[model samples]
Target chain A: XXXXXXXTGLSEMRLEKDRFSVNLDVKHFSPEELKVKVLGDVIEVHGKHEERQDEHGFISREFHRKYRIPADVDPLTITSSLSSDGVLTVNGPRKQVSGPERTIPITR
Target chain B: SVNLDVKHFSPEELKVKVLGDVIEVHGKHEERQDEHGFISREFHRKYRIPADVDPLTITSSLSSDGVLTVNGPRKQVSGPERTIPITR
Candidate 1:
């Protein structure tokens, strides 16, 4: 499940269940002690930036502005996030309750 | 700075270093057990270090979360001017 520096949009495949949507991103060079996950307007932002030292051989400084466009099916305020032991930032958005039986997408 | 997810490796199985304006990342997912089964992986990724970076300032941390983080800072650019290298 770890996509170490597996550079790109999402480190892991994002999956959406009938109840919620989930995504896991690898955020190294970062610590949960220094990050905050908040919903800015309608989109979700994982702003995990730390004031890294500016001296020594640490010449490279970078940040990520990951914005996930929340769908109407999920409650923005209920969005939650957690950092796992593998530096994976997991985000979950609660889905709206739907009446009647729904068709499930069987992922192959 | 960059963060990486390297769950397959331990401090004893990984080798890291900095050379000039480029850093090399190479590791083979040694014989190990993966959640899916026995998995072996080999990878190589090279990153260009910024010219303003101080190769000496490079520092890294390998966390239990299998996160490999590399950090550095601008090599104070004082009295200097940008010029393209002219090879003789």
Candidate 2:
């Protein structure tokens, strides 16, 4: 009998996992030399970049992108770290909260 | 109700008063400067009546030449709740 092996590579791609009623996003990307990152209310936007000339006689430019999560998810905490190879990893865990609808009476 | 219209001119505020069947309205004038460095003069007004007044409508109009008009509905009154009876 022959058995098949499953290989898991947790790098170079965005991953989302469902937890209870909420979801978590596993974000990993390259942190360009002259870029900015902003996270607000389930939305993440990388800002415009500046041109930089490295000492190794090379010029490089930066780019930004944003990702928005579902409005029903409430983010609990965010953790970020930078690796030796200039890769940035941002992880956030989200929880679900109940929002009830309201009705108001109108008088004519 | 009452209808009042107010126009502001220079140093003083104008006031107008109108009384309606169910409500009364008072109008006043105000002057304010906008962000474009232009001065805007306007008339402000308010209405007062018995607490029982409900579903009242207030209307206001302003012309291009800076004229303001206001109208309000009169308050509803039961009218003279006291009455005397005579017997012969």
Candidate 3:
């Protein structure tokens, strides 16, 4: 039950718990195949559209979709579920391992 | 004091040099050998300086439609150096 800007055509929200992680997303006027998701280290990117489709009806061949979540951070064992109402919910556990440090190496 | 002559090369066979890692090299041609034949064309290359090295100099030349030559000086290193001295 959160609100976000729709300028990017897709929206995502995340929640973290001690042993679980959840994410919710809402995409407007786009299809599931057109969206892209990228997860790097602990940062997750969702709602990126990579394809174009012909317009149909008032939905532009695609319609708005929503996602929901629980309150935990999980990098592994994450699962995503979608409902007919266009709501998608992802559930997982909080990641227990640390990630690599960001470093820029110099070459002579 | 290096003199690079590119008079015998085509307009698409020029060499490019970049200095200080901040400059963009232009007018250089890339050679592509296709199944039919070899072709050349001008392209752009970008360079970026790292935090360690501060000074760098680059020289390049290109000749075909026109003879072009470029020379640039290096940049001074920035920041302090960490050193340990022995006690007498």
Candidate 4:
């Protein structure tokens, strides 16, 4: 399913069983021009590109997206990467809560 | 220079054609489902060849960031432009 309504028009946010991730198409912006940060329980992605010459004159583009961290996911585990094809993916893995299993004594 | 965003498309999924003095860029990506999710996209863009630019010299390339750039230099006085066959 999808979440995060503010930038949902252009961005996709998903919460899988094992992870939470945000995917966005940002072909107009380069890796150097993107900024991703986690503040409190929110993940913010910002992209800014200066005007550049093109066939139809100069074109400029910028975008800002914010997503709240899922309750099951840990903010410290969040990581973001930009693919070669200009898709940015921010992943936050679920927090680990497994503990060593203990054998219980049975009273007969 | 022309720039198009094609992050969801690969090199094989895009086609660049020239019809008369107009350059056409078409990209179609079939539905794909994997660990990431499902995605399908198609886009068509056309640009008129500038009077000063040589149609025959027009060339296109795709960058790693999924931006397709088309470039053609201004016509040279000594060079004669050739017809670029149209593609279906």
Candidate 5:
């Protein structure tokens, strides 16, 4: 209920390009089956839960939920994710293209 | 002095091997970039434990905050000890 000792909140970052939106999270000690990724309303949620007894006295665990709002034009069903070997979860989606009005490339 | 960035490592991806008077930690990582291929790496470190530490009670844990802590419990006791560099 009240505890900051276990700071297991996953650190998250997002990058939006012309045609893609990608979210990366730093997490650990999670099994594939334990993670829940879904879209509710306009937000995509990623959550993982771990419950167990520590040394037969009480319990020690960490669970967190992170939500990201997706624009209406983006289809949530097309989102894809992968768990990198380093325990990083990356989710990528189709986002509306974006670019400056018009610009020519000039290397300086 | 024995701590490292544990955020990139899971307990399963690390190994600990204890010899007569030294402890060795082995860790590895594999990263994939672009669509062409992948790359991997491995790491190892050995540190000598103080003679006062009890070997049987040694322990390791990966806390929720990503701290890989290895404890060398002192068995009996010690008085005014000095540190040194021991490697073989």
Candidate 6:
């Protein structure tokens, strides 16, 4: 019901009925440099850039981010996609709430 | 010379326009269905060209890290040397 804001990373997470969503900005990183894993109820995203030279100078960058998944959401069903500009989006659909339906008989 | 970090925008979602002595960088990401309903972003920025820089020579390059670099060559201001007559 409430949208969550990440403290360390500027990523975003929100609670919705049909879907659960997480968004991360990995603009300075390449697809091969990023790795996503689901551990327990937490999802981990890591980016490691090797030392390289640029017009400015030589440098290396790395970062790790973690987000908690909702209980009703299935981690196995979660999917992720990287945008052209380097935005990583993780999405999972909520599980069906309808359990086994049963009719109760009333005694008069 | 201008360096803009546009890692969140795709190359096709960005537009670089040169108007006279001014340069405009525009970026727009259409609203797309995401896990969190929908998301979209757009920005418009303008910068004036330096007096010594030629507008026609402006060029742009986008790095793999999403940094957009826009630059132009400085106009050559040197002309043939002219000698003045000595004053009496």
Best DockQ among the predictions, by candidate number: 1
RMSD of each: 14.5, 30.0, 25.2, 11.5, 14.6, 13.1
User: What digit string (tens of lDDT, one per residue) describes model 6 on residues A1-108?
Assistant: 101111123577877889888888776678998898876787777776665543433334555566678878888788888977668888888876775668777798
- The superposed Cα distance between candidate 4 and the true structure at residue A26, in angstroms, equals 0.4
Task: Please give the RMSD of candidate 5 to the true structure.
Answer: 14.6
Docking quality level of the chain pair in candidate 5:
incorrect
Task: Compute the interface RMSD for each candidate structure.
Answer: 11.9, 34.4, 24.8, 12.1, 14.8, 14.3
Q: Relative to the unseen true structure, what is the C-alpha lDDT of residue B82 in candidate 1, on a scale of 0 to 100?
A: 43
Instruction: Give the TM-scores of the predictions, in the order they appear.
Output: 0.38, 0.28, 0.25, 0.45, 0.35, 0.45
DockQ of each: 0.08, 0.00, 0.01, 0.02, 0.02, 0.02
Write the residue-wise lDDT of candidate 1 on B1-88 in tens digits. Answer: 6666676556666667778877755565443543322334344444657766557768888888677877876554455764443355
Which one wins by TM-score: 4 or 5?
A: 4
| Candidate 5 structure quality by residue, lDDT tens digits, A1-108 | 122112244334455553334333434334552344455533333333333323222222333333444553344554545566534443445446477768877797
Task: Name the lDDT value of residue B49 in candidate 5.
Answer: 66
lDDT of 2: 0.34
Question: What digit string (tens of lDDT, one per residue) describes model 3 on residues A16-75?
Answer: 444443333344323443342324333232343333331311111112222222334434
Candidate 3's docking class is: incorrect
TM-score of the A chain in candidate 5: the value is 0.44
Instruction: Highest lDDT: give the candidate number.
Output: 6
Ordered from best to worst lDDT, the candidate numbers read: 6, 4, 1, 5, 3, 2
lDDT of 6 at A39: 69
What is candidate 4's CA lDDT for residue A75? 79
lDDT of 6: 0.67
- The candidate with the higher TM-score, 1 or 2, is 1
Chain B TM-score, one value per candidate, order as shown: 0.69, 0.26, 0.32, 0.73, 0.64, 0.77
In candidate 1, the second chain superimposes onto the true chain B with a TM-score of: 0.69
Off by over 4 Å in 3: A1-38, A42-74, A95-108, B1-88
